[PDB]
Amino acid sequence: MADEKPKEGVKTENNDHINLKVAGQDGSVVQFKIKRHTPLSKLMKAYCERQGLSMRQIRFRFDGQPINETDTPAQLEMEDEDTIDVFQQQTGG
């Protein structure tokens, strides 16, 4: 209900929104629906929060290059239903 649509009457998002999927070392993949101009950081942090991972423990990577919260999906010119590579950067103690 309100978790997907506001109390407003006429509203729509025909914007260019793409689906991004992220794959971890475990083989666990999560799918997200965000806008091309929307920071992927949202889905990235959402991934670790739901998966039980830390940003200091893992890292996202696309097009071979590492992803940051300062990166947007439109910069990498990625398409919907593409896959993100996550790896464990756990080093310390």
Residue type, 48: C
Phi/psi at 36 (nearest 5 deg)? -65, -20
**Residue 8 exposed, middle or buried by CB count within 10 Å (0-12, 13-18, 19+):** exposed
Tell me the β-bridge partners of 34.
18
Q: What is the domain extent for residue 91? A: 1-93
The CA-atom distances, in angstroms, between 48 and each of 6, 10, 24, 75 are 27, 34, 10, 22
Alpha-carbon span 59 to 88, nearest angstrom: 7
Sheet holding 17-23, edge to edge: 29-35, 17-23, 82-88, 58-62, 65-66
| Residue recorded with tokens 């965000």 | 34
The 3-state secondary structure of the chain, one letter per residue: CCCCCCCCCCCCCCCCEEEEEEECCCCCEEEEEEECCCCCHHHHHHHHHHHCCCCCCEEEEECCEECCCCCCCCCCCCCCCEEEEEEECCCCC
Total count of domains within the chain: 1
